[PDB]
């Protein structure tokens, strides 16, 4: 894997269809606490205790307490230089008829806030809700999402469970529904949206340059996508903190690389 | 990027927990047809066209014809010298207090024919069915899987679609179900069973030595497994059609696992 910026910039100049696969490193550079490894903890629990349809069935109040916490910490965050370079490149290239798409594992909408428009959110968004009754997906940025969760969601073990009755958790506001809302987030056991994967696969089939940013291509989810682009002879440029590999924060490398 | 067999054996002789990741190259050496790449076609299509939820929903007869073909060709296939050496290595190290486990996305079951017991078939089996109604998972080696597939599944293009009505495709035989069966195999766009991957990770986290044999860069998720073993500092030896050993796995593996 080459570290030549000049050699990368030569493909970048000529690339008509760029696919940027964006991992958690991009979000972390904005102060988003990465909910994986040593960080994958809230009170007594891990992600596999919280982010599952079975968890939501047994204790939706606890799952909503956690996602309220997640929403609260996320909504105070701002796009970083990497997010900005990525958006500015899409805007700039688009005026020339050249394409940039972002595939993100992240659910904080920081790419959207930076100005990214060709955005594929494979894990959904925690600022979207899904109704478990009618199936309607809705935007929700409200703080707090419901009055019962006001002041709730503290991460300390020993914090009392809110034990909010289901009726008082976030409810659908479609006329005549009133169903229980869940976060519009892909949980363990649940498949990624087939329509999204369809769009993703089309982009990978047509791209002439691929970027992996804030993650590596040997790890989920970039490991799903980058190998088949590379096997086609399309250059894959990797930007992370340890064909092309560029070391350092994406906020440092991407502004220059995507200039 | 070592190519020394002498250095591998030193690690092999003492190794307690051996994971063997077995890719499509191991199957190809037994003549099992592959369905990626230029030589990977059934009629007009490759696996990426047929092994999908969408394809099954749109033409279950064509998808079933494809897997029926693959089920039927296995009758002339045998495990190769690679499968045997892997299976003999397992039983041998067993009576020494040592672990050999095989993790594979191969669905042709030649590893278990060869005598492998610690086998993780993480992509299911050609010889297993799943009911799309009741979810029951059943072993199925019946030839043909249903009478409507008798003589069907021809691999050359221009072969007329069987166009078997869904009612005459493989049907669940659980009392009062009658649901449509699919092959119990992981498709493009589908995740692994949650427990399956949790078990893979357990083997990967505890192994002293990893073998990766006949595995392409695009096989998924299996291509992630050796990378995370190496990240631990644990030696990974590549056997293609840290160590690299070139040639048929039936030629290199007997001497490597001797
Ligand atoms: Zn509703
Ligand atoms: Zn059934």
Q: Are strands B243-246 and B209-213 parallel, antiparallel or unpaired?
A: unpaired
Residues in B closer than 8 angstroms to A219, CB to CB, are 224
Say yes or no: do domains A1-31+78-121+191-259 and A32-77+122-190 share a fold. Answer: no
Burial profile A99-124: b = 16 or more Cβ within 10 angstroms, e = fewer? bbbbbbbbbbbbbbebebebbbbbbb
Residue B87, token pair as written in the block: 């299976």
Do the Cβ atoms of A224 and B224 come within 8 Å?
A: no
Place of tokens 């959110």: A121
Q: Which residues of A touch B228 (CB under 8 A)?
A: 218
Q: Single out the catalytic residue among A68, A83, A111, A123.
A: A123
Helices A5-14 and A250-257: crossing angle in degrees, nearest 10, is 50
CB B250 within 8 A of CB B82: yes
What does the alpha-carbon distance between residue A203 and residue A236 come to, in Å, rounded to a whole number? 14
Instruction: Tell me which residue of B185, B65, B49 sits closest to B127, measured CA to CA.
Output: B185
CB B25 within 8 A of CB B218: no
Report strand pairing: A181-185 vs A124-131: antiparallel
Q: Could you tell me the fold of the domain covering B34-78+125-188?
A: SIR2/SIRT2 'Small Domain' (3.30.1600)
CB atoms under 10 Å from CB of B206, counted, come to 13
What's the rounded Cα separation, in Å, for the pair A159 and A156?
6
Distance CA A258, CA A85 (A): 6
Given a contact cutoff of 8 angstroms between Cβ atoms, the answer to whether A223 and B224 are in contact is yes
Residues with Cβ within 8 Å of B64's Cβ and at least 6 positions away in sequence, in order, are: B145, B149, B164, B169, B170, B183
CA B66 to chain centre: 16
Extents of the domains making up chain B = 1-33+79-124+189-258, 34-78+125-188
d(CA A164, CA A68): 13
Token pair 């979000």 is at which residue? Answer: A27
Count the neighbouring beta carbons within 10 Å of the beta carbon of residue B212.
Answer: 24
Give just the sign of the alpha carbon dihedral A26, A27, A29, A33. Answer: negative
Residue A22 in contact with residue A119, Cβ under 8 Å? no
Domain A1-31+78-121+191-259 has CATH 2.40.50.140: no
User: In the CATH scheme, what is the homologous superfamily, with its name and number, of domain B1-33+79-124+189-258?
Assistant: TPP-binding domain (3.40.50.1220)
Helices (H), chain B: 5-12, 24-28, 47-50, 53-58, 60-73, 81-94, 110-113, 194-206, 225-230, 249-256
What is the full DSSP assignment across A182-216? EEEEPPTTPPPPHHHHHHHHHHHHH-SEEEEESS-
- Beta carbons of B217 and A223 less than 8 Å apart: no
Ligand 2 midpoint to CA B170 (Å): 11
Number of H helices, E strands in chain A: 10, 11
Structure tokens at B244: 């690299």
| A134 closest CA partner among A179, A165, A93 | A179
For residues B243 and B183, give the distance between their C-alpha atoms in angstroms, rounded to a whole number. Answer: 36
**Which of A191, A194, A223 lies closest to B223 in CB terms?**
A223
Does B8 show up as a binding residue in the annotation? Answer: no
Distance CA B205, CA A52 (A): 24
Is CATH 3.30.1600.10 correct for A32-77+122-190? yes
A70: CA distance to ligand 1 center in Å? 23
DSSP B21-72: EE-HHHHHTTTPPP-SSTT--BTTB-HHHHSSHHHHHH-HHHHHHHHHHHHH
Q: Which helix (H) or strand (E) holds A65?
A: helix A60-74
Ligand 1 centroid distance, CA of A171 (Å): 8
- CA distances A79 to A27, A29, A75, A87, Å, are 8, 9, 11, 10
The two structure tokens encoding residue B77:
């296939």
């Amino acid at each position: 894997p080459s570290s030549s910026m000049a050699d990368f910039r030569k493909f970048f100049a000529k690339a008509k269809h760029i696919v940027i696969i964006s991992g958690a490193g991009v979000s972390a550079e904005s102060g988003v606490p990465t909910f994986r490894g040593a960080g994958g903890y809230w009170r007594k629990w891990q992600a596999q205790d919280l982010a599952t349809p079975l968890a939501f069935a047994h204790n939706p109040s606890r799952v909503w307490e956690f996602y309220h916490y997640r929403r609260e910490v996320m909504g105070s965050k701002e796009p970083n230089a990497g997010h900005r370079a990525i958006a500015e490149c899409e805007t700039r290239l688009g005026k020339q008829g050249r394409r940039v798409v972002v595939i993100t594992q992240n659910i904080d909408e920081l790419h959207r806030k930076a100005g990214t428009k060709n955005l594929l959110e494979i894990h959904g968004s925690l600022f979207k809700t899904r109704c478990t009754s009618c199936g309607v997906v809705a935007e929700n940025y409200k703080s707090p999402i419901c009055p019962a969760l006001s002041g709730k969601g503290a991460p300390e073990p020993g914090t009392q469970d809110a034990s909010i009755p289901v009726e008082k958790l976030p409810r659908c506001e479609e006329a005549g529904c009133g169903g229980l809302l869940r976060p519009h987030v892909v949980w363990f056991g649940e498949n990624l949206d087939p329509a999204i994967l369809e769009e993703v696969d089309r982009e990978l089939a047509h791209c002439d340059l691929c970027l992996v940013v804030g993650t590596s291509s040997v790890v989920y989810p970039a490991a799903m996508f980058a190998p088949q682009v590379a096997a086609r002879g399309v250059p894959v440029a990797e930007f992370n903190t340890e064909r092309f590999h560029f070391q350092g924060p994406c906020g440092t490398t991407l502004p220059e690389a995507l200039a």
